[PDB]
Ligand binder design. Sequence first.
Ligand SMILES: N[C@@H](Cc1cc(I)c(Oc2ccc(O)c(I)c2)c(I)c1)C(=O)O
Length: 366
Amino acid sequence: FGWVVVFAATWCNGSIFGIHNSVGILYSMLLEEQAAWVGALAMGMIFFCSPIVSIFTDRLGCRITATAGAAVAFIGLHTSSFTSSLSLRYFTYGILFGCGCSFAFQPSLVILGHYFQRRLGLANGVVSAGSSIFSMSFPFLIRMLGDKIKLAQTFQVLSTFMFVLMLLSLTYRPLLPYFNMRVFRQRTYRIWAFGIAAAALGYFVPYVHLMKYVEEEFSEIKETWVLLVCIGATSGLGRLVSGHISDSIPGLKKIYLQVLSFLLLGLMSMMIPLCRDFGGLIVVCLFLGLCDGFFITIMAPIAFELVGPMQASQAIGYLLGMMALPMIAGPPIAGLLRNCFGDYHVAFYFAGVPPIIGAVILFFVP
Ligand SMILES: N[C@@H](Cc1cc(I)c(Oc2ccc(O)c(I)c2)c(I)c1)C(=O)O
């Protein structure tokens, strides 16, 4: 019955981050029929509310919290269709759908620890790999829909994924039996969360500015899309094996194989500006995807390893809360160096440094 929960969490993570990762198409259509920050608000509200979501999880159960969050997300994403004013779309999709996604997603991570302890890394790896499949499908589905239906009906169609998520979150049967600062009482969690938050600043910069760099520098190449394939080809792969490998390494030594990611996640991050040809860029992006998958997958299992399963909910929620600010901050800062220095090179260097600082911080946790 654990794989039923794995399927439910896969649907959750995939739908939430496939609707968010495809936010450009719907709003491009809306312009065709200020606008930038509502998507950032929706994406960051998943992280900001996580400390709040942890308390509701601890009190009401993962099933109840996830079901309520998915219901709120469905309500927001559905009423976003009937809204004709942009101001109402800062609420219905911005804060309402955003908070719904946070309340739906934090229990999605927490529930996997109720069932798997020995193969928890494998379960999270499968969830992340399957979720990447959803994340690389929604961009297409909306572009099929737009050619036949308007944007409002597009929100209505996207709402049934939240409806199905609300139905599926009923499977979070709890086996294991309000501002608790007791999680911060552990120094290892503090240092680990600090390092993760530091790395998150430079984490999202490549997936935002890599396309712009390629279309600006490598103008002779028209088939740039293969790069997004390469990450998609490797990241999900990196999400699978790492999870399995996450089970082979016992205890806090697991953090080392996350540190190993960060350094490479940093190093390749400074290798895009150094690539004079295209094949080198593809090779670098392969390792970038692999390190992305490693960074994504190990996050939850290490929380259970450090703080246990009675406290993993608060640890995950607070970790996402601290992660919230750097993830939003990164790409805007990279755009600032882009505008100032005249190239993305300095942007990628400042994107690659924070992963290295995070690796240095995390190296001393074990
Ligand atoms: N999912 C998108 C964006 C994204 C990336 C990361 I790192 C996120 O933080 C996580 C992820 C898994 C965990 O177990 C924990 I604890 C925290 C989140 I929330 C979203 C991507 O593929 O990059």
